[PDB]
Design a protein around this motif. Structure first.
Motif, PDB file in Angstrom:
ATOM      1  N   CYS G 106       0.959  -1.367  -0.354  1.00 49.05           N
ATOM      2  CA  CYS G 106       0.212   0.198  -0.065  1.00 49.05           C
ATOM      3  C   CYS G 106       1.030   1.385   0.111  1.00 49.05           C
ATOM      4  CB  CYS G 106      -0.925   0.034   0.936  1.00 49.05           C
ATOM      5  SG  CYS G 106      -2.063   1.265   1.253  1.00 49.05           S
ATOM      6  N   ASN G 108       0.199   3.757   1.744  1.00 49.29           N
ATOM      7  CA  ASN G 108      -0.358   4.994   2.760  1.00 49.29           C
ATOM      8  C   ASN G 108      -0.307   3.760   4.201  1.00 49.29           C
ATOM      9  OD1 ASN G 108      -1.289   6.743   4.948  1.00 49.29           O
ATOM     10  ND2 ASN G 108      -3.772   5.972   4.533  1.00 49.29           N
ATOM     11  N   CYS G 109      -0.652   2.352   3.921  1.00 47.64           N
ATOM     12  CA  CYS G 109      -0.732   1.627   5.079  1.00 47.64           C
ATOM     13  C   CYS G 109       0.575   0.679   4.711  1.00 47.64           C
ATOM     14  CB  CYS G 109      -2.123   0.106   5.450  1.00 47.64           C
ATOM     15  SG  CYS G 109      -1.432  -0.368   3.633  1.00 47.64           S
ATOM     16  N   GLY G 110       1.403   1.273   3.829  1.00 48.09           N
ATOM     17  CA  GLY G 110       2.477   0.435   4.051  1.00 48.09           C
ATOM     18  C   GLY G 110       2.590  -1.375   3.802  1.00 48.09           C
ATOM     19  N   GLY G 157      -5.235  -2.186   5.432  1.00 50.49           N
ATOM     20  CA  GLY G 157      -5.127  -1.675   4.394  1.00 50.49           C
ATOM     21  C   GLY G 157      -5.566  -0.085   4.211  1.00 50.49           C
ATOM     22  N   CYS G 158      -4.894   0.569   3.314  1.00 53.27           N
ATOM     23  CA  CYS G 158      -5.967   1.881   3.444  1.00 53.27           C
ATOM     24  C   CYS G 158      -6.278   2.541   2.464  1.00 53.27           C
ATOM     25  CB  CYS G 158      -4.328   2.306   1.897  1.00 53.27           C
ATOM     26  SG  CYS G 158      -3.937   2.171   0.749  1.00 53.27           S
ATOM     27  N   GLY G 159      -6.657   0.769   1.440  1.00 57.41           N
ATOM     28  CA  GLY G 159      -7.507   0.572   0.301  1.00 57.41           C
ATOM     29  C   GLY G 159      -7.443   1.857  -1.147  1.00 57.41           C
TER      30      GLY G 159
HETATM   31 ZN   LIG Z   1      -2.426   1.257   3.791  1.00 51.14          ZN
END
Ligand SMILES: [Zn+2]
Ligand SMILES: [Mg+2]
Ligand SMILES: [Zn+2]
Ligand SMILES: [Zn+2]
Lengths: 51, 171, 84, 107, 168, 97, 519, 229
Positions: G106, G108-110, G157-159
């Motif tokens: 991801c 953002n969430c990595g 997750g960031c999605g």
């Molecule tokens: Zn994320």
RNA sequence: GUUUUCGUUGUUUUUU
């Protein structure tokens, strides 16, 4: 000198006086500056037109 | 606390020193190298139990000037202080900065801030010592102290005592 | 897990030319280092001939650790590993 | 047949070793640059072949380990090779040293 | 100079606080951990010995070595003179004096008897035997590592050990 | 000038069983330096002083687990550019297994 | 043995573990902080402390000692420094791997688009190899249209939809397909964002992204600090005898560090947007040239004279680079190369060696009880003739320059000393010709010290070499230990190479005059 | 497990030869003297004439040779060639025995056929290549020694022994000992760099030079072109 | 004063 790249090297060379012919024959060369980019035998092989 | 360690050594023998009793020579060389030396991993080396039956393995030959490696493996008893060691000890010297307690190869150092408030220096009384109600810290006396300092110094690890907790001092 | 038993040794009962070179060089270098002499000397000033004579009667205090591919090894005394 | 083409002879066992190595892993292995570099041993060999930097990038990205078992590791570290004379470890022993006269005792 | 049978322990990232030696917290360091192997990897526990038993063992080892040197033929100093080195002589004499001054049990019989009796962690019993105590409250004051186990079982131990104490 | 020992000469010596000979050709006849490396990190990251007899691994605070290595100087160069390219070639005097 | 005493026990390297270098460990090895591009402190010797030529990093001359270790070239092992980058950058050999790691987790969430929940990813992670498991992770990530905020049940997750990652110039750009297709927001992937997502990566994730927690890290894959080499590595190299031209490495380090200071100046000053871009890209291709000046599609960093500037990448790959030209091939001593001549009256396993070769080349014979007389004869004989010692090596290591020694013959030999005895007759020596195809081209001949400056040989031994005496240069190598002499005599001798294993036949025969005669 | 210096081209006598010629070279005939061993060469022809134990022994050896014939002519060497690099120069050993012990003249034999047969059966087992006790060890031993045993049988069968060179006690015993010694010296030395040896031994031939052979076919092989030219 | 101090890039031509 700035355009050192893409420059031909060997068109002018030090005259040899090891022997007298080392000058005379030295003054009557010819050169084909194609390069070994693709080896080939045609630049090196004698041809009938060279007779 | 006395700890038994499987102390070992590696000997690089000069090439001219080959012979039938070669391994036994190793013994004395080990004996002249193991003792008189300290290390942080083991501590003060004091004795090697069963030194006449030490196993070195099948000795190996160095491909070179002719030397030989000897993985001399054995069992020994080597002493090492530990932090929090609350053990009766005998003091060696008395100083205003802190009395010295020769506890084994080391010498216990008492910090300026780890001396009880009832302990006051009286140099006039012989021997120089500390006196209090039923308390007498002199040479050869059994005084309970806690080793609170343990730092490796390649040649000898120092021990620092503490007399600033309950049930500490002279028995 | 390391030493293949002398009877369990399933490799050649003979010394190898590589072993020949190693043993000769090692013994001659040893005696060159003023190590004890295991044979007699007539005129062999260079230590190599002395090591060669040692190998002839196989009076050499060395042992060969022939490493097996699996990881184990076979220990062969000089005097028990046949001359080749 | 290629060896016999000029008429010269080569020993059976060596090029038999060749062809078996070509086949000992069940498929056909090439002497091509990537083909030899597709191996996953110590990178110290495949990188030293060519394009060293790329193989080092792949190995460091995988944080690989070289066991120094190849002879190339020995030569570029300058120690005894595990071949022939180095295919063993000749050792000074004790059972035969005991037969020596006592005068040979180290001091 | 001196190697050890314990190897590996390469640069790792999963760290633990067990790096500073500490007796009261039951810390022995990574070198003296719970599961150690000898040169051949044989399974064996860490050796812990009480001061009186250590004194008997060192005395008997020294006398055995002296008799082996004599080859046919009891003081601490003569036994300490076995090794070489002025500093070695000093340290061995000093540790023998430490053993003599801090051996709660003197002769062979009482040390042997307490040896069968004391032998659940071997190190805690070893330090219980080594640390001379008189009664329960003194023991709990001087030992913070045995605070609670639902069975102290220590008054009988201290009573018998004091029955085995050297009188004077 | 010295005789540049070609790689085919190395290969033929290897086929000849010349371990010690080629070794001294690369050890005594060629570059040979000794260094002091760490046993924890397994790198040459050790301030070394023979006369002082001090060998401190600033990387790992290692002083007693320091080992001496008599290896070609070209190996030192190789390790150097491997370090310089942010690659960590951790030399180890032991076997992870 | 010959080295000065060191308590460090004699050991060799048994394993080599690869991987990246953490910046924290980079400082843990960095012996001094380097920030000054300027090298010579006051142009009066004693180069700048804390600069590229910091003496603390090492000493460069005969008398000076490394301030770190305390010894000069004699023992100075080289010491490293660190230079903190003003901004994290990319490693030239990891941008494809940057794309790889950006195709898996991801933005953002990595974290990985999946976990071991799906059988494909789990079986991929059961692979022992890091690279293979991570590439299979990619191969299953491409089976999903979006960075799943749930199962394709939130996985943390960031999605946000995975951007289309492309190596856009030196850096990379990710076409985020946000809420048929939204505005394509491909942007400069600043290394800070990548550091963030890498830190978001769980140890289990990096493990399943084919990485070791204790070792090489995607975080380490982002450069935050560069290593400054010891001055020994890029020393003052003589452009003209004494006048030294500054090393190419020094030039490039200076360029990179001045660009870095420009970047450091980009903040406190007025920076109208694109100035930061240009200075950052300047610093970026400077660093790239540090790894690789040969960046494709770019006019390489070039000297004002016109020649391009080199990089470390160049000297490690090629035909005679580090590995090829210094490690698998390097010059040796006690080696000679000269003409070959025929000696019909000479034995097969001997070469007629010139007195020059047999004299200059020598073997160290240890002084023993049997050779004491002859070794002393050699020492007293003289260093400028044969046989004779030119150096006598003490058992501790001390040496004596016999020629410069006015008491050359006054060196009483101790049992354990070494005497560089000049190469005698019948000395076994390695024998080498170029080219050398078959192993029979390496042959151990006995030196026969005889006049003339050629190599006198038997006719028959020349045929396996397939050489002649029309001016061929031939190579001789003198053993320097007893092991070597024994090895030469028992595993490389002329008689040992008679039979070719190729056609299981001898290599040699009677040729020329002898053959016509015997006919 | 042999080095490339101890094998030599040897002709296995059984492989060629008319079955009639093979029979009248290998099979014996005691009852009928027409194809028998001549009494001059032996001191036991009267024992030979009419005996059955000797006949059945020589039989068993004959069908052993027939089995070897199958093994070679149908499996190992099939079409036209019977000369192959195998260890131990039997020919020279036999000639050496003849010239040492003066095997000329027609003196009668003090050595009996069972001696030859027992010696051959013993020596067939005495050949050692892979040492150890596991069954696969001896299977590999058989695999290595099959051709050598077949060749020795093609050379050292009792019939040939007596009708040609009549090995005496000393001759036969030293022949067996020398064969065993040479075979045990014929083993590969562990540690050889056989890979580099092969590399050089293949490359050096290529360093000298319409059907695809020579360097072209070599390169098709080495690059592993998916289809040859 | 034992000891004791030269190098590279590029270019050409070369050598069985
Ligand atoms: Zn994320
Ligand atoms: Mg030539
Ligand atoms: Zn370290
Ligand atoms: Zn240094």
């Amino acid at each position: 000198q700035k355009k050192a790249m893409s420059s031909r090297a060997g068109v002018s060379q030090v005259l040899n006086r090891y022997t007298y012919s080392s000058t005379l024959s030295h003054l009557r060369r010819t050169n084909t500056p194609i390069g070994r980019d693709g080896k080939l035998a045609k630049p090196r092989q004698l041809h009938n037109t060279h007779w | 606390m006395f700890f038994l360690k499987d102390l070992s050594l590696i000997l690089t023998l000069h090439p001219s020193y080959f012979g039938p009793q070669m391994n036994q020579y190793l013994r004395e060389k080990l004996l002249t190298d193991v003792e008189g030396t300290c290390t942080g991993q083991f501590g003060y080396i004091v004795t090697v139990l069963d030194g006449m039956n030490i196993d070195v393995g099948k000795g190996r030959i160095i491909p070179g000037s002719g030397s030989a490696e000897f993985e001399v493996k054995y069992r020994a008893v080597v002493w090492k202080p530990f932090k929090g060691e609350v053990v009766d000890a005998i003091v060696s010297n008395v100083s205003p900065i802190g009395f010295f307690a020769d506890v084994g190869p080391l010498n216990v150092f008492v910090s300026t801030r780890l001396i009880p408030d009832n302990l006051v220096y009286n140099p006039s009384n012989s021997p120089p010592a500390y006196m209090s109600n039923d308390e007498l810290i002199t040479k050869g006396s059994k005084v309970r102290l806690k080793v609170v300092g343990t730092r490796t110094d390649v040649n000898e690890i120092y021990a620092i005592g503490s007399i600033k907790e309950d049930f500490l001092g002279a028995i | 897990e390391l030493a293949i038993l002398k009877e369990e040794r399933t490799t050649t009962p003979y010394l190898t030319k590589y072993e020949r070179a190693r043993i000769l060089g090692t013994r001659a270098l040893q005696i060159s280092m003023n190590a004890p002499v295991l044979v007699d000397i007539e005129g062999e000033t260079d230590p190599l001939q002395i090591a060669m004579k040692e190998l002839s009667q196989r009076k050499i205090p060395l042992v060969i650790r022939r490493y097996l591919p699996d990881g184990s090894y076979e220990d062969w005394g000089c005097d028990e590993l046949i001359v080749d | 047949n290629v060896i016999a083409f000029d008429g010269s002879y080569v020993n059976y066992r060596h090029m038999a070793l060749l062809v078996d190595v070509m086949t000992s892993r069940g498929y056909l292995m090439a002497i091509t640059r990537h083909g030899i570099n597709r191996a996953d041993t110590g990178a110290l060999m495949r990188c030293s072949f060519e394009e060293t930097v790329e193989i080092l990038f792949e190995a460091g990205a995988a944080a690989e380990l070289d066991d120094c078992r190849g002879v190339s590791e020995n030569v570029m570290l300058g120690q005894l090779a595990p071949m022939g004379t180095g295919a063993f470890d000749v050792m000074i022993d004790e059972k035969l040293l005991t037969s020596l006269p006592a005068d040979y005792a180290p001091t | 100079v001196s190697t050890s049978t314990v190897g590996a322990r390469r640069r790792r990232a999963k760290q633990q606080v067990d790096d500073e030696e500490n007796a009261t917290l039951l810390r022995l360091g990574p070198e003296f951990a719970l599961k150690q192997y000898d040169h051949d990897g044989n399974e064996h526990d860490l050796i812990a010995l009480s001061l009186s038993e250590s004194r008997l063992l060192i005395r008997e080892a020294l006398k055995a070595r002296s008799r082996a040197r004599n080859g046919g033929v009891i003081d601490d100093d003569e036994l300490a003179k076995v090794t070489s080195g002025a500093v070695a002589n000093g340290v061995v004499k000093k540790t023998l004096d430490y053993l003599n001054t801090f051996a709660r049990f003197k002769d062979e019989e009482t040390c042997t008897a307490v040896d069968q009796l004391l032998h659940l962690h071997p190190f805690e019993i070893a330090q219980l035997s080594s640390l001379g105590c008189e009664d329960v409250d003194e023991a709990i004051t001087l030992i913070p590592s045995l605070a609670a186990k639902k069975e102290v079982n220590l008054q009988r131990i201290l009573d018998e050990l004091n029955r085995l104490e050297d009188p004077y | 000038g010295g005789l540049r020992f070609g790689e085919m000469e190395r290969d033929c010596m290897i086929a000849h069983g010349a371990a010690g000979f080629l070794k001294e050709r690369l050890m005594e006849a060629s570059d040979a330096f000794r260094v002091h490396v760490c046993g924890i990190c397994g790198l040459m990251s050790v301030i070394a002083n023979l006369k002082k007899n001090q060998f401190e691994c600033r990387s790992c605070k290692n002083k007693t687990n320091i080992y001496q290595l008599h290896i070609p100087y070209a190996a030192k160069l190789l390790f150097q550019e491997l370090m310089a390219m942010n690659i960590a070639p951790r030399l180890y005097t032991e076997r992870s297994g | 043995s010959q080295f000065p005493y060191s308590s460090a026990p004699l050991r060799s390297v048994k394993e080599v573990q690869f991987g990246l270098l953490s910046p924290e460990e980079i400082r843990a090895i960095s012996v001094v902080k380097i920030e000054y591009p300027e090298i010579m402190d006051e142009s009066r010797q004693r180069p700048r402390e804390g600069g590229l030529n910091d003496p603390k990093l090492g000493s460069i001359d005969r008398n000076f000692k490394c301030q770190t270790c305390g010894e000069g070239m004699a023992e100075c092992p080289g010491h490293f420094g660190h230079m903190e980058l003003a901004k994290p950058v990319f490693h030239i050999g990891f941008i494809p791997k940057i794309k790889k790691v950006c195709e898996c987790i991801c933005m953002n969430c990595g974290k990985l688009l999946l976990d071991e929940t799906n059988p494909t990813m789990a079986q991929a992670i059961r692979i022992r190899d890091p690279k293979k498991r991570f590439n299979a992770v990619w191969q299953l990530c491409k089976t999903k249209m979006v960075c799943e905020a749930d199962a394709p049940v939130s996985r943390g997750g960031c999605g946000n939809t995975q951007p289309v990652v492309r190596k856009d110039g030196m850096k990379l750009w990710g076409t985020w397909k946000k809420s048929r297709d939204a505005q394509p927001e491909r942007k400069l992937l600043t290394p800070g964002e990548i550091l963030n997502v890498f830190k978001h990566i769980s140890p289990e994730d990096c493990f399943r992204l084919g990485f070791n927690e204790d070792y090489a890290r995607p975080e380490w894959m982002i450069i935050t600090v560069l290593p400054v080499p010891p001055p020994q590595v890029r020393p003052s190299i003589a452009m003209d005898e004494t006048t030294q031209g500054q090393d190419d490495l020094t030039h490039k380090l200076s360029d990179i560090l001045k660009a870095n200071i420009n970047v450091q100046k980009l903040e406190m000053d007025g920076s109208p947007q694109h100035i930061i871009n240009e200075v950052e890209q300047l610093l970026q291709f400077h660093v790239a040239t540090y790894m690789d000046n040969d960046i494709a599609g770019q006019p390489q960093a070039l000297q004002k004279s016109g020649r391009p500037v080199k990089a470390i990448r160049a000297r490690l790959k090629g035909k005679e680079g580090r590995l090829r030209g210094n490690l698998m091939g390097k010059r040796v001593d006690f080696s000679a190369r000269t003409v070959i001549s025929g000696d019909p009256n000479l034995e097969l396993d001997q070469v007629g060696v010139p007195i020059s070769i047999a004299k200059t080349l020598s073997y160290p014979e240890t002084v023993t009880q049997y050779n004491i007389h002859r070794l002393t004869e050699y020492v007293r004989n003289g260093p400028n003739e044969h046989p004779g010692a030119k150096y006598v090596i003490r058992d501790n290591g001390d040496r004596i320059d016999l020629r410069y020694h006015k008491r050359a013959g006054d060196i009483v030999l101790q049992y354990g000393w070494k005497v560089e005895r000049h190469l005698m007759d019948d000395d076994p020596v390695l024998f080498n010709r170029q080219p050398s195809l078959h192993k029979m081209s390496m042959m151990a001949h006995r030196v026969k010290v005889m006049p003339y400056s050629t190599f006198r040989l038997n006719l028959s031994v020349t045929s396996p070499y397939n050489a002649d005496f029309d001016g061929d240069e031939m190579n001789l190598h003198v053993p320097q230990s007893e092991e070597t002499r024994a090895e030469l005599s028992q595993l490389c001798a002329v008689p040992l190479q008679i039979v070719s294993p190729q056609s299981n036949k001898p290599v040699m025969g009677i040729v020329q005059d002898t053959l016509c005669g015997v006919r | 497990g042999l080095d490339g210096t101890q094998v030599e081209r040897q002709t296995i006598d059984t492989i060629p030869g008319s079955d009639k010629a093979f029979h009248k070279r290998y099979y014996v005939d005691l009852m009928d003297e027409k194809n028998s061993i001549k009494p001059d060469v032996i001191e036991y022809a009267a024992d030979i004439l009419g005996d059955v134990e000797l006949q059945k022994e020589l039989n068993s050896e004959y069908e052993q040779l027939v089995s070897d014939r199958k093994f070679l002519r149908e499996i190992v060497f099939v079409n036209g060639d019977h000369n192959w690099p195998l260890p131990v120069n039997l020919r020279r050993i036999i000639q050496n025995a003849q010239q040492i012990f003066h095997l000329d003249r027609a003196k009668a034999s003090d050595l009996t056929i069972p001696e030859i047969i027992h010696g051959v059966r013993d020596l067939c087992k005495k050949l050692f290549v892979l040492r150890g006790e596991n069954e696969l060890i001896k299977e590999a031993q058989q695999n290595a020694t099959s051709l050598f045993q077949c060749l020795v049988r093609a050379r050292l069968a009792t019939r040939r022994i007596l009708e040609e060179f009549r090995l005496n006690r000393d001759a036969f015993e030293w022949v067996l000992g020398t064969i065993e010694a040479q075979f045990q010296r014929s083993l590969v030395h562990p540690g050889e760099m056989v890979g580099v040896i092969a590399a050089q031994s293949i490359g050096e031939p290529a360093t000298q030079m319409n059907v695809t052979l020579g360097v072209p076919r070599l390169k098709e092989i080495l690059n592993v072109a998916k289809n040859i030219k």
